[PDB]
Amino acid sequence: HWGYGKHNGPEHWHKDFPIAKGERQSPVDIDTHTAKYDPSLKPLSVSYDQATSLRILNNGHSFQVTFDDSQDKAVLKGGPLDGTYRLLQFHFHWGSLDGQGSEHTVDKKKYAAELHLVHWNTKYGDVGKAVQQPDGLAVLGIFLKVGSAKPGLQKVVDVLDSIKTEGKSADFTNFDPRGLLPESLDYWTYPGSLTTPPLAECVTWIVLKEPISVSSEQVLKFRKLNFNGEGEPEELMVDNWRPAQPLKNRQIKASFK
Template sequence: MNGVKAKALGCLYQQLKSLRSPARPCSLAACSRKNRNAALHPLWQSPLTIPGGTRQSPINIQWRDSVYDPFLKPLKISYDPTTCLHIWNNGYSFLVEFDDSTDRSIIVGGPLENQYRLKQFHFHWGAINDWGSEHTVDSKFYPAELHLVHWNAVEYPTFEEAVMEGNGLAVIGVFLKLGARHEGLQTLVDALPAVKHKDTVIEFDVFDPSCLLPSCPDYWTYAGSLTTPPLTESVTWIIKKKPIEVDEDQLEAFRMLLFTSDGEEEKRMVDNFRPLQPLMDRTVRSSFQVRHLLDTEAQPQGHAEQVRP
């Protein structure tokens, strides 16, 4: 293992100890981006990069520039609710973690050549509703974004090793928008006060994260990276086109969490997203044909399907 990988792996172990531990200033996108980045958590304040990185995330997805790929397979999702283990406030988000020792909760198909096991899911969100998502679509921000993190257990023996390799991870991204109360999410929201402080963990079992996925099967996909250290370029991103709706109270429950431990000066957990990264020479592929460039609520087009048991 070379020096860069060794250093990144060391950073990874520090970031992923969960394996062993139970007012809008203007309407312009550029102005919003400047203001949303002004109060970021220190983890995202500096322009973190990896040497020679060419596939960093998140990115702005341009409808016009995305390329329809008729050969993209349907994305098949099979989650076992009993594999859910606990919720952990790790100091920059809350992670809902799963038993990934077997193939009980997996995804397969889509742009993936292997099946991938679900490891955890988490969210990124803003201090206000004008921003919060990591990815954007035509420079549009959403209040929050869900990430379901999976790893390639076919080719790699451990999650940590998969993190270091180009095809090691697959992350489903789902945008959240303000609207109706999300009944599936509410079970999780009700548990959040118990993990208000950094490093708190509670048991959280029998939860099916497929309830957090939109029914529309359409998605974009591209080769990218983790958005937290070690920022390894190991992620196949699958960004769902259609957002899910959550209400104001549910978003506020996220914002009541703290970056800080019990006894420390309280710092609200908000704006926990990484700034946008350059697309460079990458292509964003879509599973659907672009017919209405600005209509992310369009009905599914073409052959794509999403299968859940």
């Protein structure tokens, strides 16, 4: 099926998911001097104090930390959003080299990785229903640059050895995702899509201005994961990012000046 290689990568996805060429595809380049400050945008409300992490898992295209989304526990609200969105999972996209790896870009600049905190609109009842709606998901995107270590990321780094290959998972309870956030919650926002198949056009994107810094040792451990399953020819899980897509008839709004 689909992946990030030369014969199944982003240039191939449209054949099984024709919405790949749709009108609100993600990621995009954020042109900072074309994004307009919108003074009617509210501050984001990130309420993660009650977050309950469950598992960490290699799904053959990234690794994901999953949360209990059966109650309002870890929710995103405010910003451009109406209503309440529950945190379901987070995952990353990263490169083979530090100059590439993010999905969104900023004035064509690529960061070393990008964190996606995936939330779904509780008015649709379950995530499967939400992905069929134009306002079903809100993904909070955070850029990673290589510099100083991110202490809140180390517990994730520590366990990646135990989920090296596709299909492996581990208990990952009591993880606090607040340790992955930068200081500022200033943000760009636009309407877009999932960046992996099925590429559904169901996402309000909220991309934070301020990257987090992670150490070279931390991102190196990302690069030691495998796309393949156990026992099969080792292909390093690197460059699992979709490139920027046409902005088409969309405006990116900034919450800052």
